[PDB]
Amino acid sequence: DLSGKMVKQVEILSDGIVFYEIFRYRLYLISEMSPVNIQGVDLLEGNWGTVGSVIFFKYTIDGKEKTAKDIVEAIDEETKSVTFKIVEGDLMELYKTFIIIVQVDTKGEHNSVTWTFHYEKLKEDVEEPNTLMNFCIEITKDIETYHL
């Protein structure tokens, strides 16, 4: 009831392999590639690209500065997937639980990035995370257009 799921697949022009490299091992590059959206990506514990690593994000949503602390809960290298669980931050005032999965289809033929949110709202009247999903799609477009 308070439970929800949201899925968006977007086709990318850029190399899926580089998208996965970013999201697994070089996540700090997103501050450079989507500087309107992301002001800081700071590793707090562990190492980049390892399950159990803890990462702090400074980001802007609707011109408001927000933060989150996330743990990397899962990595699947064969499917090119990484699962982030948000443990602290502005989102935790609206959601009890929030999990973000990013998965890159690297056929090479055509490449795409699928974003999945699994969340538990604190109340029934809390909104579905549409704005966050728009935010994630904007970062994807910023990343794929960064090379040009």
Ligand SMILES: [Cl-]
């Ligand atoms: Cl690992």
